[PDB]
Design an enzyme around this catalytic site. Structure first.
Site, PDB file in Angstrom:
ATOM      1  N   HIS A  61     -22.765 -32.399   3.465  1.00  0.00           N
ATOM      2  CA  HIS A  61     -21.892 -32.503   4.611  1.00  0.00           C
ATOM      3  C   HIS A  61     -20.582 -32.832   3.785  1.00  0.00           C
ATOM      4  O   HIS A  61     -19.519 -32.691   4.640  1.00  0.00           O
ATOM      5  CB  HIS A  61     -22.536 -33.359   5.254  1.00  0.00           C
ATOM      6  CG  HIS A  61     -23.753 -33.035   5.652  1.00  0.00           C
ATOM      7  ND1 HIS A  61     -24.104 -32.121   6.818  1.00  0.00           N
ATOM      8  CD2 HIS A  61     -25.119 -33.655   5.411  1.00  0.00           C
ATOM      9  CE1 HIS A  61     -25.269 -31.986   6.873  1.00  0.00           C
ATOM     10  NE2 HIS A  61     -26.009 -33.132   6.044  1.00  0.00           N
ATOM     11  N   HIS A  91     -16.027 -41.555   1.823  1.00  0.00           N
ATOM     12  CA  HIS A  91     -16.119 -40.225   1.834  1.00  0.00           C
ATOM     13  C   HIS A  91     -14.867 -39.517   2.853  1.00  0.00           C
ATOM     14  O   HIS A  91     -14.248 -40.381   3.484  1.00  0.00           O
ATOM     15  CB  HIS A  91     -17.340 -39.773   2.640  1.00  0.00           C
ATOM     16  CG  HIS A  91     -17.427 -39.953   3.858  1.00  0.00           C
ATOM     17  ND1 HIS A  91     -18.093 -41.239   4.253  1.00  0.00           N
ATOM     18  CD2 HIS A  91     -17.041 -39.410   5.019  1.00  0.00           C
ATOM     19  CE1 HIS A  91     -18.022 -41.231   5.538  1.00  0.00           C
ATOM     20  NE2 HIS A  91     -17.463 -40.274   5.909  1.00  0.00           N
ATOM     21  N   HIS A  93     -13.432 -36.225   5.377  1.00  0.00           N
ATOM     22  CA  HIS A  93     -13.427 -35.015   6.159  1.00  0.00           C
ATOM     23  C   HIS A  93     -12.296 -34.363   5.997  1.00  0.00           C
ATOM     24  O   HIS A  93     -11.238 -35.030   5.979  1.00  0.00           O
ATOM     25  CB  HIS A  93     -13.785 -35.411   7.724  1.00  0.00           C
ATOM     26  CG  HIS A  93     -14.930 -36.330   7.956  1.00  0.00           C
ATOM     27  ND1 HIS A  93     -16.269 -35.924   8.142  1.00  0.00           N
ATOM     28  CD2 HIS A  93     -15.031 -37.710   7.637  1.00  0.00           C
ATOM     29  CE1 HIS A  93     -16.978 -36.968   8.314  1.00  0.00           C
ATOM     30  NE2 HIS A  93     -16.221 -37.998   8.058  1.00  0.00           N
ATOM     31  N   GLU A 103     -10.868 -36.293  11.863  1.00  0.00           N
ATOM     32  CA  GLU A 103     -11.751 -36.377  12.787  1.00  0.00           C
ATOM     33  C   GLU A 103     -11.126 -37.330  13.895  1.00  0.00           C
ATOM     34  O   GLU A 103     -10.818 -36.633  15.307  1.00  0.00           O
ATOM     35  CB  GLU A 103     -13.003 -37.414  12.373  1.00  0.00           C
ATOM     36  CG  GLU A 103     -13.485 -36.613  11.321  1.00  0.00           C
ATOM     37  CD  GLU A 103     -15.122 -36.959  11.149  1.00  0.00           C
ATOM     38  OE1 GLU A 103     -15.442 -38.127  11.175  1.00  0.00           O
ATOM     39  OE2 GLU A 103     -15.905 -36.048  11.511  1.00  0.00           O
ATOM     40  N   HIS A 116     -12.991 -42.173   5.040  1.00  0.00           N
ATOM     41  CA  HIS A 116     -13.711 -43.140   5.790  1.00  0.00           C
ATOM     42  C   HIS A 116     -14.214 -43.999   4.648  1.00  0.00           C
ATOM     43  O   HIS A 116     -15.188 -43.679   3.949  1.00  0.00           O
ATOM     44  CB  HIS A 116     -14.843 -42.452   6.407  1.00  0.00           C
ATOM     45  CG  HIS A 116     -14.634 -41.878   7.869  1.00  0.00           C
ATOM     46  ND1 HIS A 116     -15.287 -40.848   8.588  1.00  0.00           N
ATOM     47  CD2 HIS A 116     -13.361 -42.042   8.590  1.00  0.00           C
ATOM     48  CE1 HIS A 116     -14.604 -40.481   9.366  1.00  0.00           C
ATOM     49  NE2 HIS A 116     -13.575 -40.923   9.535  1.00  0.00           N
ATOM     50  N   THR A 195     -19.734 -40.608  12.821  1.00  0.00           N
ATOM     51  CA  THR A 195     -19.278 -39.264  13.445  1.00  0.00           C
ATOM     52  C   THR A 195     -20.435 -38.177  12.882  1.00  0.00           C
ATOM     53  O   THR A 195     -19.913 -36.973  13.218  1.00  0.00           O
ATOM     54  CB  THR A 195     -17.971 -38.970  12.963  1.00  0.00           C
ATOM     55  OG1 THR A 195     -17.772 -38.532  11.561  1.00  0.00           O
ATOM     56  CG2 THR A 195     -16.915 -39.992  13.379  1.00  0.00           C
TER      57      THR A 195
HETATM   58  C1  LIG Z   1     -25.356 -44.457   2.527  1.00  0.00           C
HETATM   59  C2  LIG Z   1     -24.622 -44.884   3.805  1.00  0.00           C
HETATM   60  C3  LIG Z   1     -24.715 -43.936   4.895  1.00  0.00           C
HETATM   61  C4  LIG Z   1     -23.614 -43.630   6.029  1.00  0.00           C
HETATM   62  O1  LIG Z   1     -22.439 -44.030   5.513  1.00  0.00           O
HETATM   63  N1  LIG Z   1     -23.597 -42.851   6.737  1.00  0.00           N
HETATM   64  C5  LIG Z   1     -22.421 -42.283   7.666  1.00  0.00           C
HETATM   65  N2  LIG Z   1     -22.790 -41.261   8.575  1.00  0.00           N
HETATM   66  N3  LIG Z   1     -21.253 -40.947   9.417  1.00  0.00           N
HETATM   67  C6  LIG Z   1     -20.601 -41.911   8.618  1.00  0.00           C
HETATM   68  S1  LIG Z   1     -18.843 -41.843   9.280  1.00  0.00           S
HETATM   69  N4  LIG Z   1     -18.202 -40.392   9.181  1.00  0.00           N
HETATM   70  O2  LIG Z   1     -18.987 -42.157  10.919  1.00  0.00           O
HETATM   71  O3  LIG Z   1     -18.135 -42.640   8.381  1.00  0.00           O
HETATM   72  S2  LIG Z   1     -20.893 -42.680   7.388  1.00  0.00           S
HETATM   73 ZN   LIG Z   2     -16.816 -40.068   7.972  1.00  0.00          ZN
END
Ligand SMILES: CCCC(=O)Nc1nnc(S(N)(=O)=O)s1
Ligand SMILES: [Zn+2]
Ligand SMILES: CCCC(=O)Nc1nnc(S(N)(=O)=O)s1
Length: 257
Positions: A61, A91, A93, A103, A116, A195
């Site tokens: 993803h 990470h 997007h 986002e 993020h 998200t």
């Molecule tokens: C190993 C950490 C797991 C994790 O971070 N899961 C997330 N799922 N959506 C995220 S977002 N795009 O809201 O930052 S983070």
């Molecule tokens: Zn994110």
């Protein structure tokens, strides 16, 4: 399984994750004229000097740069937050085109990408417990626009060849995430969610006003990643962003006048 395609994208997520239609979903459009300055918000405290990056993973993803979160090494505190939040991963997007990818939006403006930096509230002991709590996570969101290169991003860009496909990881030590911040820490903040599925409503969102600039070549390398695993039909990892969700009964607060 959920994704960002025509048949498994954000409009489908509610069927397996009914919270997708919940009361505090993210991302949201930040209407800059409606966000209210909150003079009681403290300055953000970003303490990344001791950050220990470990690994970079293509999870099908996005790609996650993971950190050692077994001690208070890289923490976020202050701002709207009570207590100490430990950096676990960052990470991005991003879009298939420079005109989309973020986002959060700002007055409906979409940026080319959004970083993020994900942190969990240390009072809950581990990330898995934190995500079950309304104040379990703090995600620092940083917009990317295309222009001058971001020198501190290049080490990330250059390893992406080694994690092209879902499930591939690579050693990624000694990466300093301070190299991804903008100059100003002015921010908007509101209560929201992950998200991506499971879309849990556990995030205090802190979205920086000042974007960082990355080069076209840098973002082009993001777009060469694959959603698919090795040996599967190639689907470029692009447009891995969820669109803005209803603000509902929420106020976005600004740290700045
Ligand atoms: C190993 C950490 C797991 C994790 O971070 N899961 C997330 N799922 N959506 C995220 S977002 N795009 O809201 O930052 S983070
Ligand atoms: Zn994110
Ligand atoms: C042809 C792709 C088949 C597919 O992916 N179908 C889905 N229907 N809902 C999904 S999810 N996890 O977003 O809710 S996936």
């Amino acid at each position: 399984h959920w994704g960002y395609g025509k048949h498994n994208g954000p409009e489908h997520w509610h069927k397996d994750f009914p919270i997708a239609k919940g009361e505090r979903q993210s991302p949201v459009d930040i209407d800059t004229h409606t966000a209210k300055y909150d003079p009681s918000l403290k300055p953000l405290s970003v303490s990344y000097d001791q950050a220990t990056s470990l690994r970079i993973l293509n999870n099908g993803h996005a790609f996650n740069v993971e950190f050692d979160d077994s001690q208070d090494k890289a923490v976020l505190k202050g701002g709207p937050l009570d207590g100490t939040y430990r950096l676990i991963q960052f990470h991005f997007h991003w879009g298939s085109l420079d005109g989309q990818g973020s986002e959060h939006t700002v007055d409906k403006k979409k940026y080319a990408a959004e970083l993020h930096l994900v942190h969990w509230n240390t009072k809950y002991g581990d990330f898995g417990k934190a995500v079950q709590q309304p104040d379990g996570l703090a995600v620092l969101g940083i917009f990317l626009k295309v222009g001058s290169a971001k020198p501190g991003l290049q080490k990330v860009v250059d390893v992406l060849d080694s994690i092209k496909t879902k499930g591939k990881s690579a050693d990624f030590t000694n990466f300093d995430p301070r190299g991804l911040l903008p100059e100003s820490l002015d921010y908007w903040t509101y209560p929201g969610s992950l998200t991506t599925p499971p879309l849990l409503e556990c995030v205090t969102w802190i979205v920086l006003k000042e974007p960082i600039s990355v080069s076209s070549e840098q973002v082009l390398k993001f777009r060469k990643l694959n959603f698919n695993g090795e040996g599967e039909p190639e689907e470029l990892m692009v447009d891995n962003w969820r669109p803005a969700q209803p603000l509902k009964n929420r106020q976005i607060k600004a740290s700045f006048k």
